[PDB]
Amino acid sequence: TTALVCDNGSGLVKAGFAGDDAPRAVFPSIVGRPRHQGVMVGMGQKDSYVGDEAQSKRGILTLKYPIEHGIITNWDDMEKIWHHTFYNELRVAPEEHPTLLTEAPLNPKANREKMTQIMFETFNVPAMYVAIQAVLSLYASGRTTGIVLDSGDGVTHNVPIYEGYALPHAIMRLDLAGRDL
Amino acid sequence: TTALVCDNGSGLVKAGFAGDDAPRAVFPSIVGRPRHQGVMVGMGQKDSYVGDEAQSKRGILTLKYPIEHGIITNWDDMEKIWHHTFYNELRVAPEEHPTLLTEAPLNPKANREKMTQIMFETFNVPAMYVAIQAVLSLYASGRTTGIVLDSGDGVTHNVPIYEGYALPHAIMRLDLAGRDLTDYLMKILTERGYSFVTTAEREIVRDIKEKLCYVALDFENEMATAASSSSLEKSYELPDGQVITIGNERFRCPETLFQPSFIGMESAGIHETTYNSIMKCDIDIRKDLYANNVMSGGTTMYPGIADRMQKEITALAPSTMKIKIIAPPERKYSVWIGGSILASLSTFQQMWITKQEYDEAGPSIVH
Amino acid sequence: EDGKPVWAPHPTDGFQVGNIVDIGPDSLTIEPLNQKGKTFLALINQVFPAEEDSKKDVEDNCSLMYLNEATLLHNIKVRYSKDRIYTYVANILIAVNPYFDIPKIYSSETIKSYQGKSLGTMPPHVFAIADKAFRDMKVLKLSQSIIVSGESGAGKTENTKFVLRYLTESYGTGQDIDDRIVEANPLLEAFGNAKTVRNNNSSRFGKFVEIHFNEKSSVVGGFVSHYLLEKSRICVQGKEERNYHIFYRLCAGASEDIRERLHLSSPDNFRYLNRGCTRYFANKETDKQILQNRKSPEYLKAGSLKDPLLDDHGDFIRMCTAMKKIGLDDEEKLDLFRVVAGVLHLGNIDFEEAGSTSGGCNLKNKSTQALEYCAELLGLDQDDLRVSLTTRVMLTTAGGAKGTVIKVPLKVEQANNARDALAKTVYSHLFDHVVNRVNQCFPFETSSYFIGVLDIAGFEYFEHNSFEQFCINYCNEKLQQFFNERILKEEQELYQKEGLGVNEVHYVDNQDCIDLIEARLVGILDILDEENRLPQPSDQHFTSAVHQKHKDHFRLSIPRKSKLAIHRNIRDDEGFIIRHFAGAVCYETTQFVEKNNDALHMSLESLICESRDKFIRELFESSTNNNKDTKQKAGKLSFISVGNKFKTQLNLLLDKLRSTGASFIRCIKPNLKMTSHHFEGAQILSQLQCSGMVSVLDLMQGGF
Ligand SMILES: Nc1ncnc2c1ncn2[C@@H]1O[C@H](COP(=O)(O)OP(=O)(O)O)[C@@H](O)[C@H]1O
Ligand SMILES: Nc1ncnc2c1ncn2[C@@H]1O[C@H](COP(=O)(O)OP(=O)(O)O)[C@@H](O)[C@H]1O
């Protein structure tokens, strides 16, 4: 029934059902393991904390951003991000909805393949598609023509679209803003 | 009731009923498919956009002229031209009235047959007739004698007519004006550092060929002061904001029509093809062919003709004989203003090829 | 037949008598009986069998030997000159408005002549249908409904009051509800009656007056219900059409000690009125009374509209007399004029382009005094209201961490559609407050069973048809479905009751016509709600998508194939032809999307609800009894819907009709001028073919 838009930002991963208001959950793309010896013996701790809670536990962990310069480092950390997003934020079962995933305009082959394959076999979703993040920013201001400057951590892009075709030969990708800032 | 004159332009298809004003629809014949992958996902897009709608969306299409070298490319594109023309302009179904179509003088057989045959089977008109585009400018000027000029992008023709009979033995057809003037303008404006490789951008070349060019009176002598410091620059502005200042090429491009040796081809200039058609007529008739030299077609709209043509012909024609050249206003619609008078009046109400007559006769009824 | 006189297509009278003197496969060489030398050719659908003696008429139309649609037309031509306005056609009563008072047929002596007697034991009358509805209620254990269709002024007002007179005098024996409809007669006329091309004064809502009966079977109360008041008409009007009649009676009829309070101007100065017709209706004495400052340039140039029963100058005066009769106070009547005058100054506000930074839209310099003189009428702050008409307020708080309240501006087209969505919310909730105030002047004792009257606007067709006539005629197709559903059920409850047989007929279905208009993301209304959602809405894309996907359906063709020559001028993406129960009516698609695309922003819906006046806060619900307040913010449903909210409210009325029995009373208008004895067979034959009466005669194959 209701589709799910889950955005693979490098921020600030954003998660919320299809329309009509705002992202349900936003938190920094951080997984962090504990770097100090345990001595209070609850034990009470996790093998890995995701955000929000990995940003409440500052100074006791070693933060690892799983997406770096426009690519995910390995899918072992990525799946734990995913598990946190579906379960303790959105709460819904993955088999319930068709999902919609985002990518970066001009992202390396075969990282959309490997992604699509791993995500189907790990979470067992019933249908899916991947739309690029710059193109979607056309829809937000509801224009059918124009050059889109979509700038987020850690990849900005410059994509030209004209009524309503995207020129494959004029797309520019900068690996610059915002983590280098 | 009324008949419809729908002119199969070289350009520039013209459509309007018979009388009393001017053509109702003009658009530049093109079909254009979308040349890049879609991303807005309405889906919302036509299989092919025809003109004028294919000219309000330049740069995302692959423009294909259906009329090229004086013949239609295929009726797969042509029927879609026709359907667009009747339906989203004139607002009438072809089964309503007798139609009138135009062609190019000395048209390739059986491409006037195949045309006539296909148009009857595709649109199911109640009557059909095809008149040649040069001859119709005779009616437009209201004359009874004289040589008639249908010059369009890119086949011109030169037909002599005498009171009011046509002469089969003196008709001349040139493959030259006006698409070779367009293609040449792109070849000598590239010569001053402005490239325009793509088809859509070629339309911009046509638009400055229309607006900014003019015909020199004495080529060598206008060329001399062009070589001088003197400013012949007129500044054009382009769709992306580019400012182009052209001088020399501005009078060079139409001059191509005199002495086609600029291209290097053997074909004679309009100057001489006009003359040689007159000197293929019987000697007594020549007396009334001078001063009934009547020009027409949109490609003759350049300023500086006909009085260049006049001064040039008067130099080649025999001494102490008067030659005044007749240049109509609004020459771009001349042919259509011809057709309009003919098909509206009696006698020719009983001279159409009607449905039973066509069905009984078959395709060999055109000649 | 062969030999016997048949009906022949006559221009002014519809059908004339005639004979067949040569024949073809489907063309007949018809010689007229009374004009023998004219001898024309006519088709199979223009010839119909006729009875042997023309010196007769039928009281029971099932008694015809030749029962067809031409012999039904001849029966009400002869009976009109015998002073008989009622005609029994099976379970369908055909009542013809005579436009004068016939001797002794509406009398109290006439009422006790029919009393308690069943069909086939008394001749045709409307009191034999009203007496049937009391007996096919208590014994049958089923609530009842009288369904009234037909063109305006055809007798659908007059037969309904004779039914409610007969249920009060014959069976209620009192109960004060009969003239409370009469006491607020101009009061409910002004709010819902408008002007259309075909109808000068037609009510545009589904007036559903229900009459409660208890377990003892006494008349214990009534209740007035309203359905489907036209949303688009509030803001947009076509050529020579008007808005509602209270928007002309308040403009014309307001005094100078009331107009200085409301700050009224002539209709050319009100943006929701100047686009249609601004002329007022009047009479010879009131045409002298309309003041120089009340006249618009249309009234200055062309004066008052012509019609003997309509006066817009006097009926605002006779409206305020009626508020004393029904039960409205003198303090509250003035607050019922500030809300109506606040709608008129709501439409004048306008919104231009972005300035520079942060995108969005701003107000026009000439729309500053248009917001200040409106905000004191609707009770809103002049500085806070400008923000809500130009931005979209939302939050960063929604499911994870606690955030704050952010601002996303609206586009220019999203602000123009939002200002008209506010006027289609305020006048719509005002009209439920006028009806709910009237229903509290006679609160019912109890409930159990009910005999109600459904009256609705008929099948409307003009020279060019729009979105307003697509939603009226879509309501009449569904009501035509329920008409044919009860007729097939009646014949099925007749043949084993009287022993006639086991015979059965192929039902006249219309599911392909329903599936064409509405479905599960397949209909025309399904494409229409999709077009409102698009990044840039268009009018060329809405028409072309209908014949892209819905091409296979038979009841849809391109406008250029039209049988009527006049609609062939329209081209491919400008319109479509939809075949219905009353024929193929073409519609243009110009402004069809524009009238559908209104939508209302969350903190603009939660700003007019937050109003700084007291009569206004009462308007957007909910009552004190079981009190519970509307939330400050929301998210969903943005667009909401126009063409789906009109379909959803109609589905609440079709399922209420399915729980009731049926009493179908079709009303025929005999002439245009509304004068006695006059007869037009170019208007009478057209109302048999536009009221569903033809579909019933083509379902009747019985022969009994
Ligand atoms: N007010 C602000 N000023 C400057 N930078 C900001 C502000 N708010 C957020 N950011 C930066 O923007 C980034 C989030 O960008 P985002 O749109 O989430 O990119 P993506 O969607 O590609 O992850 C954060 O890393 C943060 O550093
Ligand atoms: N003012 C002008 N000066 C020069 N050339 C023109 C002018 N206006 C139109 N043309 C040319 O004339 C052509 C149209 O000629 P037209 O009479 O339509 O020929 P045809 O009727 O055979 O199609 C166009 O291709 C255009 O390039």
Ligand SMILES: [Mg+2]
């Ligand atoms: Mg991004």
Ligand SMILES: [Mg+2]
């Ligand atoms: Mg030509």
